[PDB]
Target: Phospholamban
Amino acid sequence: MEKVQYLTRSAIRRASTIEMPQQARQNLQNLFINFCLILICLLLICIIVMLL
Amino acid sequence: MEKVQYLTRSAIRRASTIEMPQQARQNLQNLFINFCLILICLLLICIIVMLL
Amino acid sequence: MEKVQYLTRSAIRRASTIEMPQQARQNLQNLFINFCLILICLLLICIIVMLL
Amino acid sequence: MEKVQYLTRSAIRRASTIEMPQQARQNLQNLFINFCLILICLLLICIIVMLL
Amino acid sequence: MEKVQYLTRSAIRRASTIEMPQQARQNLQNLFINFCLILICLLLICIIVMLL
Model:
């Protein structure tokens, strides 16, 4: 019953930490950006590899 | 009549939240950046797929 | 005479807002980054289109 | 024995500085992002070189 | 003699401003990120041009 509510809450937690009262938000923000950038780096590596 | 005004306001809201008094601006800022980065990642994926 | 001074000031304004006393700097900072990312996205789109 | 603990701590240090109490977090955050972007730039250079 | 020390200091200055006490760090941080992104944009342009 409330199983789904927990999951819903988990979703909220994921979206609440990134906006937590503490300025640590910038840290998470920094990680998400870094991760996305890393993914791009990997994609570029894969592109180089795939093409060559 | 004021229909357009509401839309205009909606535009303002979109541009006001990103600069809301709260430091949560960084959170939104983080999301826009993440989304843009994600789009790039997808584009790169599409490039890999299209080329290969 | 002072025409050029106004332009010089305009240049300063462009470089002063991004560093305005208010923490809104992050908002502008966010936009410049988003715009640059958007340009990259467009470039990638153009690359996909050009190649394919 | 505690050798591994030191390494574990070193890992924590790497993840603690990026979130240090000071707002200098943004500086580190800036560097990680810059480094990732730089890597992308290099990758792009390598792509240009590899393709051409 | 102290010539090198000045250069060393210059290096420190470059790494001290990005982490200056003022929150203007975000402004510099913004510029480094924008510049890196711009370089990527240019690289992409060069890629489009080189390939096509």
Remarks:
- Chains D and C do not touch (no CB pair under 8 Å).
- The radius of gyration of chain D is 17 Å.
- The first helix of chain D runs from residue 3 to 17.
